[PDB]
Amino acid sequence: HMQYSIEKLKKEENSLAKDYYIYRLLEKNKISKKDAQDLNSHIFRYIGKIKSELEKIIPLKPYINPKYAKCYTYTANTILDANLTCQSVRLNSLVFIASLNSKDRTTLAQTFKNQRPDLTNLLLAFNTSDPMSYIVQKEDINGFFKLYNYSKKYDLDLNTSLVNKLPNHIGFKDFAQNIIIKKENPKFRHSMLEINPENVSEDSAFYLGVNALTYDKTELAYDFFKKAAQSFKSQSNKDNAIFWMWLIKNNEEDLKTLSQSSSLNIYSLYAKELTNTPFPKIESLNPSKKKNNFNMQDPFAWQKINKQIRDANASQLDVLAKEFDTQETLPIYAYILERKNNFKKHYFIMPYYDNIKDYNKTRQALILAIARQESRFIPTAISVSYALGMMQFMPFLANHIGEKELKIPNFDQDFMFKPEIAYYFGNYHLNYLESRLKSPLFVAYAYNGGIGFTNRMLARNDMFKTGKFEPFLSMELVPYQESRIYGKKVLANYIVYRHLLNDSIKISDIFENLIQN
Numbered sequence: 253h254m255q256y257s258i259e260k261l262k263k264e265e266n267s268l269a270k271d272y273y274i275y276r277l278l279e280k281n282k283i284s285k286k287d288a289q290d291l292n293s294h295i296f297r298y299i300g301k302i303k304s305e306l307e308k309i310i311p312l313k314p315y316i317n318p319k320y321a322k323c324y325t326y327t328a329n330t331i332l333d334a335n336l337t338c339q340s341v342r343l344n345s346l347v348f349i350a351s352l353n354s355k356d357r358t359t360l361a362q363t364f365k366n367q368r369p370d371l372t373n374l375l376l377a378f379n380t381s382d383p384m385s386y387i388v389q390k391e392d393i394n395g396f397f398k399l400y401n402y403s404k405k406y407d408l409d410l411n412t413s414l415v416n417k418l419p420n421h422i423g424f425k426d427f428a429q430n431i432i433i434k435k436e437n438p439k440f441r442h443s444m445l446e447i448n449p450e451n452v453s454e455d456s457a458f459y460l461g462v463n464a465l466t467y468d469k470t471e472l473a474y475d476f477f478k479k480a481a482q483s484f485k486s487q488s489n490k491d492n493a494i495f496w497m498w499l500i501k502n503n504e505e506d507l508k509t510l511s512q513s514s515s516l517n518i519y520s521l522y523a524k525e526l527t528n529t530p531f532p533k534i535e536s537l538n539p540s541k542k543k544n545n546f547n548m549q550d551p552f553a554w555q556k557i558n559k560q561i562r563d564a565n566a567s568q569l570d571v572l573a574k575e576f577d578t579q580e581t582l583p584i585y586a587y588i589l590e591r592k593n594n595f596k597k598h599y600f601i602m603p604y605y606d607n608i609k610d611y612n613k614t615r616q617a618l619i620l621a622i623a624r625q626e627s628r629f630i631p632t633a634i635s636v637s638y639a640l641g642m643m644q645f646m647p648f649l650a651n652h653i654g655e656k657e658l659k660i661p662n663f664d665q666d667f668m669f670k671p672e673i674a675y676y677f678g679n680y681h682l683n684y685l686e687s688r689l690k691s692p693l694f695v696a697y698a699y700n701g702g703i704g705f706t707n708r709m710l711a712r713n714d715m716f717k718t719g720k721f722e723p724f725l726s727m728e729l730v731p732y733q734e735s736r737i738y739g740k741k742v743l744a745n746y747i748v749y750r751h752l753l754n755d756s757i758k759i760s761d762i763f764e765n766l767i768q769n
């Protein structure tokens with residue numbers, strides 16, 4: 253490999269690459285207390301392992317606004333001795349409110365009834381055995397979400413008037429998504445059958461459709477999915493909603509509209525196959541030029557050219573298109589062309605093909621499918637979790653395969669930035685997953701979320717079994733959003749690559765194999 257001292261890193265631009273190499277120093281204990289002093293301002297994304305690792309060296313004291321400093325010297329026993337500003341600041345915390353004695357909640361409720369009746373409602377609510385039931389009786393919507401955030405355990409029936417107020421609050425999106433996907437708060441869930449589709453849109457409308465289906469309310473479901481179809485920004489999400497309109501009410505205009513979609517996704521591909529519509533046009537990228545001056549193995553060069561491409565006018569893109577129109581830079585070319593045709597055309601490149609042409613055509617397609625979604629084939633790709641290269645191996649996994657299993661001499665996790673190694677480790681890991689899971693959809697779930705996650709999901713008696721709307725409904729209820737989306741996208745990619753390799757499979761065969769018989 254190649255190493256970077258903290259001093260060389262401090263001279264590179266802030267980026268995930270620089271963060272990755274700082275994290276490597278921290279995990280090998282190579283950052284002194286002295287080196288760590290100014291280090292916060294050299295970190296692009298100060299979240300997760302790099303933060304908990306830096307704070308083992310230089311602990312951070314949780315920020316308190318100097319205006320309110322004196323407000324945090326009071327406790328539940330002395331809050332009545334604080335000025336009215338301090339009293340109102342401390343009451344932002346429901347935990348603080350829960351900690352007060354009931355007589356001091358009655359006193360502060362009276363004090364704030366006039367200018368802050370939100371605080372009065374929460375104080376008087378915690379003087380009852382069911383704060384949620386009190387807040388719901390007041391139809392205090394801000395209080396409702398502050399309570400939900402304090403504890404997910406509150407559950408109560410909500411009437412038509414109250415549930416139709418919830419969508420107007422910022423918190424409604426996450427609330428509806430989490431309780432429907434996690435199958436928690438059954439009374440909240442049942443209550444959301446009465447939300448007017450007029451009052452919701454986009455993701456929330458869609459999840460309220462999935463909710464209606466779980467109660468076999470097919471009419472309410474169609475209406476939610478239709479509103480989702482009308483309001484969603486991305487054609488891919490519209491297609492998903494229109495598919496549900498079709499599956500529930502079987503109007504052949506919905507399926508026609510879906511078969512004619514400019515988005516390539518499992519729903520449009522399926523609709524095309526049901527209507528004997530031809531397979532969509534795939535762009536053909538074949539640059540004659542061999543190489544250029546750019547190092548595809550320099551993670552720092554990628555992070556920098558990535559930013560330039562994001563922030564380029566039409567004029568600079570046409571200059572970048574020409575520079576990067578080579579076989580060695582094909583994945584960057586495809587990325588520039590995607591931005592330059594304003595995301596209208598279908599690019600499914602097959603770079604470093606020599607490394608996979610000896611595997612059977614089905615395996616080539618799964619590898620390419622995963623690589624396209626993982627990295628867009630960028631060899632030095634780095635995730636916010638520092639998953640590495642074209643196939644986005646987490647370090648623990650790259651090291652387990654490289655060191656324990658393959659005993660590669662002088663193995664370093666940065667070998668995942670080499671196409672040869674990424675494709676090779678991809679094949680090796682896919683043999684592990686495919687031997688246990690079979691379906692390329694299940695393999696996709698396990699590649700992104702893990703075989704543990706996937707085994708526990710498939711073992712549930714309500715996931716990927718026989719039913720009216722299966723396996724489509726199961727694909728909407730995969731409990732980890734990243735994995736739910738990853739499966740749909742990789743499956744679409746798999747169908748396309750199998751077509752380009754003259755090893756076509758019908759997506760309807762894939763869907764039949766998802767139901768465990």
Ligand SMILES: CC(=O)N[C@@H]1[C@@H](O)[C@H](O[C@@H]2O[C@H](CO)[C@@H](O[C@@H]3O[C@H](CO)[C@@H](O)[C@H](O)[C@H]3NC(C)=O)[C@H](O)[C@H]2NC(C)=O)[C@@H](CO)O[C@H]1O
Pocket residue numbers: 587590591625626627628630633634635636639644700734737738741
């Ligand atoms: C080269 C480039 O910037 N291309 C654009 C794409 O980035 C963009 O879609 C997103 O691609 C990235 C990979 O570049 C995807 O990130 C990966 O997500 C998977 C899980 O799905 C995760 O396991 C990987 O670690 C992660 N990789 C990295 C490097 O973080 C991301 O999920 C894609 N976005 C979506 C919505 O799926 C496409 C489409 O907008 O545009 C290209 O121009």
Ligand SMILES: CC(=O)N[C@@H]1[C@@H](O)[C@H](O[C@@H]2O[C@H](CO)[C@@H](O[C@@H]3O[C@H](CO)[C@@H](O)[C@H](O)[C@H]3NC(C)=O)[C@H](O)[C@H]2NC(C)=O)[C@@H](CO)O[C@H]1O
Pocket residue numbers: 639643644645646649652698699700701702703704705706
């Ligand atoms: C491509 C990539 O890096 N993907 C990551 C996932 O692999 C990872 O999920 C976890 O993967 C490991 C490695 O396969 C799983 O560990 C295995 O667990 C089984 C039983 O559950 C055990 O018998 C195996 O011996 C063990 N192998 C090793 C080498 O430890 C682990 O279970 C997966 N985790 C879950 C929650 O399923 C995920 C999340 O860590 O990240 C991906 O990026």
